[PDB]
């Protein structure tokens, strides 16, 4: 079977695209692109789509587990939060696409050991002020899951100890205690 079978992933994933258009509400600008659940179909989709550094400002990619929409209001996002990476304009050139790819692999490869089930998905926001990459988890009060996801994520990106990243609750973000956790 190793010669002809695709390699199934532990989860089915959905990639979303956001295009800012002020003619529409925020939710109406969010659209599902396609779904995949094997290694081969992931790479066929990835090689087909623009790199994040090539999207126009105001666009997002979101990769989330099937059945979870990339918004605060989803049942699996209400009580959760995000591990947030902030990139200056220089870092769009040097780190955005490679950090985003590593994030994608952390997701579909379930790199967070027993706490991968706490992972909902990830978002990259391309903006003129500064891009952002985030991993969304399902429970902001789950201290032991969040911290472990934070340490693995940080070392998988190669961020040095001189850098610190923060975890923010969506309830805090949606009301417009900033960082609950830092690693």
Long-range contacts formed by 69-78: CB under 8 A, 24+ apart = 69/16, 69/30, 70/16, 70/30, 70/121, 70/123, 70/136, 71/27, 71/30, 72/170, 72/171, 72/173, 72/174, 74/120, 76/120, 76/138, 77/120, 77/136, 77/138, 77/170, 78/170, 78/171
Binding residues: 26-27, 72-73, 127-132, 175-176
Binding residues for mRNA: 26-27, 72-73, 127-132, 175-176
What sign for the dihedral angle of Cα 149, 106, 102, 70? negative
């Amino acid at each position: 079977p190793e010669h002809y079978i695709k390699h199934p992933l532990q989860n089915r994933w959905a990639l979303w695209f956001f295009k800012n258009d002020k003619s529409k509400t925020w939710q109406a600008n969010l659209r599902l692109i396609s779904k995949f659940d094997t290694v081969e179909d992931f790479w066929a989709l990835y090689n087909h789509i623009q790199l994040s550094s090539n999207l126009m400002p105001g666009c997002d990619y979101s990769l989330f587990k099937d059945g979870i929409e990339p918004m605060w209001e989803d049942e699996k996002n209400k009580r959760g939060g995000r591990w947030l990476i902030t990139l200056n304009k220089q870092q769009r050139r040097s780190d955005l696409d490679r950090f985003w790819l590593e994030t994608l692999l952390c997701l579909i490869g379930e790199s967070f050991d027993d706490y991968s089930d706490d992972v909902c998905g990830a978002v990259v926001n391309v903006r003129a002020k500064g891009d952002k990459i985030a991993i969304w988890t399902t429970e902001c009060e789950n201290r032991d899951a969040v911290t472990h996801i934070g340490r693995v994520y940080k070392e998988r990106l190669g961020l040095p100890p001189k850098i610190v990243i923060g975890y923010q609750s969506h309830a805090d973000t949606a009301t417009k205690t900033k960082n609950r956790f830092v690693v």
